[PDB]
Amino acid sequence: GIVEQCCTSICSLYQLENYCN
Amino acid sequence: VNQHLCGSHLVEALYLVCGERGFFP
């Protein structure tokens, strides 16, 4: 999920944007 | 720099990139 992908590990803009409405 | 985005920081980043369009968890 997002915190694993972005908080625990580092995510890119692209990955982050996959969770915008 | 620290590239991790946790809690408040993640929301802020999501607000920034996703715009007033908004973000889903």
UniProtKB/Swiss-Prot annotation, chain B:
Outcome recorded upon mutating F23S: In HPRI; Los-Angeles
Protein name as annotated: Insulin B chain
Superkingdom, natural source: Eukaryota
Natural source organism: Homo sapiens (Human)
